[PDB]
Design a protein around this ligand. Structure first.
Ligand SMILES: COc1ccc(OC2CN(c3ncnc4c3c(CC(C)C)nn4C)C2)cc1
Ligand SMILES: [Mg+2]
Ligand SMILES: [Zn+2]
Length: 338
């Protein structure tokens, strides 16, 4: 409750006072100490004018932000620092790409809130694991699909329905319904299976050109932007890409270990005895990440640098690939590992 006191009474720090490069695509939000992230969320909301536009109650917003942060567990990748960095990228898209020409204010607001909430209570395992392990989440959502994403949305709703945390309780009934419906679609769009299903519709929209008067184009654009925020760790330098691969594979291999112990054969990328990290990262960059930022570049010319950084990071994997072969003897001069 002392974090809350300071967050409410100390005042909202200007965005520049965090870092002079905070609003740039070159900035790495993971460099920000975890203890300064809740204040950074308030600074970003204030800078986007959401607090004033929607007359958000300060005690309510302060409680909401801390409740969202508390709602994340500590697996190697799907933790609060992932949600914070994804939310930071949404802010970057707002600051650098002129979203206001494409989306409604409420849609841009829903995107940011969804970014903060999109992986709430993640346990470090994927959708297939929920079903295979017969988890409570699969009992609740397996028949509807996107098990984890349905849970993240339900966790966001449970936070909003906690006394003193409903940042939208003063909204009109229509605006309240709209907001929760947007959060549903945006959070469900974080399932990469959903992205791969709509990819041809995203290509078609970029091809014909975005139509601001087409409601389906608004829905498709919000899906693309959310996916762009979720994979944004790949738009920085090699240092971020390398570190993120360590976190992702530590999480994946922990799942694979659980599947093996259950008598199940894990997917290749989740099996520490079979996974070849450079090949898997090249495949993910080439077939998932690069086409996303290419679509983003096609719709927004100012997003060109993002695609170029992703392409550069993909090329760095090919460059370091030879290091994954043990040439000579290991550092200890022993072949005991055999
Ligand atoms: C349905 O087809 C698929 C799904 C996943 C797949 O690649 C895995 C995802 N992996 C990633 N690798 C590096 N940076 C990543 C990710 C992700 C998503 C993960 C946290 C889940 N986000 N970021 C920033 C490697 C290949 C194909
Ligand atoms: Mg997710
Ligand atoms: Zn995520």
């Amino acid at each position: 409750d002392d974090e809350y006191t300071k967050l409410l009474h100390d005042g909202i720090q200007p965005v520049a006072a965090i870092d002079s490069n905070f609003a740039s695509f070159t900035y790495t939000p993971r460099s920000l100490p975890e203890d300064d992230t809740s204040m950074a969320i308030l600074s970003m909301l204030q800078d986007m004018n959401f607090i004033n536009n929607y007359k958000i109650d300060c005690p309510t917003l302060a409680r909401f932000c801390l409740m969202v942060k508390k709602g994340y567990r500590d697996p190697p990748y799907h933790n609060w620092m992932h949600a914070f960095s994804v939310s930071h990228f949404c802010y970057l898209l707002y600051k650098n790409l002129e979203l206001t020409n494409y989306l409604e204010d409420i849609e841009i607001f829903a995107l940011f809130i969804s970014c903060m909430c999109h992986d709430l209570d993640h346990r470090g395992t994927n959708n297939s694991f929920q079903v295979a392990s017969k988890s409570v989440l699969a009992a609740l959502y397996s028949s509807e699909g996107s098990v984890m994403e349905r849970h993240h949305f339900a966790q966001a709703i449970a936070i909003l329905n906690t006394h003193g945390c409903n940042i939208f309780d003063h909204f009109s009934r229509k605006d309240y319904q709209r907001m929760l419906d947007l959060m549903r679609d945006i959070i469900l769009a974080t399932d990469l299976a959903h992205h791969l299903r709509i990819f041809k519709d995203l290509q078609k929209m970029a091809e014909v050109g975005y139509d601001r008067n087409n409601k389906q184009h608004h829905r498709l654009l919000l899906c693309l932007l959310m996916t762009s925020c979720d994979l944004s760790d790949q738009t920085k330098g090699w240092k971020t890409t390398r570190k993120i691969a360590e976190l992702i594979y530590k999480e994946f291999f922990s799942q694979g270990d659980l599947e093996k112990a259950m008598g199940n054969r894990p997917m290749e990328m989740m099996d520490r005895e079979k996974a070849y990290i450079p090949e898997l990262q090249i495949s993910f960059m080439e077939h998932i990440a690069m086409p996303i930022y290419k679509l983003l570049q096609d719709l927004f010319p100012k997003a060109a640098e993002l695609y170029e950084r992703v392409a550069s990071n993909r090329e760095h994997w090919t460059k370091v690939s030879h290091k994954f072969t043990i040439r000579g003897l290991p550092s200890n001069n022993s072949l005991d590992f055999l």
